[model samples]
Target: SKVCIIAWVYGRVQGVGFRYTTQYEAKRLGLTGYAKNLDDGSVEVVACGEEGQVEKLMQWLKSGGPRSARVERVLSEPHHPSGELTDFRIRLE
Candidate 1:
């Protein structure tokens, strides 16, 4: 199984619906993970799925949503699937 943790820095990411977009995108790709709004003015996610799906998700994240979002950075890295989630979602903290 393919897995990853990606950190994202988006311009005006706070309150811009990026987390919702991430949840939708990840679910559509049949991935299991969570996206959360960070206190430090960024977003972070951990996703796991087939390699192809993960790759597609990562690209989408870097490109931002179809809306007028300004994505600054997307940092991705390999991970071991822990089966921690059954579906993609937004983790509210």
Candidate 2:
């Protein structure tokens, strides 16, 4: 049973290499998911992992990354994981 979710990432999501950093973290953590930028000024990602792994990932996402990220808030929610991904990557949309 995989727990899936969509995170409505906020603050400094764009122009800060956020997707790259997050994708790297996801891969490093060995989780599966995809992240993308929303036109309405928010970043979104869907991921699946054990409870512990998700917690760690969520921590980074909320705290920022690469010593330059300033993540203010992370709106997390449970959703049905599409299982449409195997490798972690940033959706260029």
Candidate 3:
């Protein structure tokens, strides 16, 4: 089964290579979506992939992402997969 999720990671996320590390994790899980830095200093991640893999990614995010990230919290919800993204990447905006 496949699933999609949109998660917002808060606290010490930006300028900590959060997006890049997130891309690496997503790609490793064979997920497709994007990780972007929000203006509010949080990271927005949308990932779609196998159910297990998506779950893994979500857990990883909730666990505080990369070493530099001090994840204060994570808010996530189910999302509808677009089926358009071919690979995971970091969105500059």
Per-residue accuracy of model 1 over 1-93 as CA lDDT, tens digit each: 555556565566768788888888889999988988877888888887787788788778777754757777666664323333347644443
> Can you write out model 2's per-residue Cα lDDT over 1-93, one digit (the tens) per residue?
456677988887787888888899988887899989999888897777776677678778877755666777788874324333446645542
**Backbone atom clashes (below 3 Å) for every candidate:** 0, 0, 0
Highest TM-score, which number?
A: 3
Model 1 residue 44 CA deviation in Å: 0.4
Please give the range of 10 consecutive residues that has the lowest summed lDDT in model 1. Answer: 77-86
Model 3 TM-score is 0.82
Q: How far in Å is the alpha carbon of 64 misplaced in model 2?
A: 2.2
Worst 10 residues of 3 by lDDT: 78-87
Clash list (residue pairs), candidate 1: none
Alpha-carbon TM-score of each model against the true structure: 0.73, 0.76, 0.82
Q: At residue 82, give the lDDT of candidate 2.
A: 36
The whole-model lDDT of each prediction reads: 0.72, 0.75, 0.84
Quantify how close model 2 is to the true structure by its C-alpha RMSD in Å.
8.8
Q: Decide which is better by TM-score, 1 or 3.
A: 3
Candidates' RMSD to native: 8.6, 8.8, 8.6
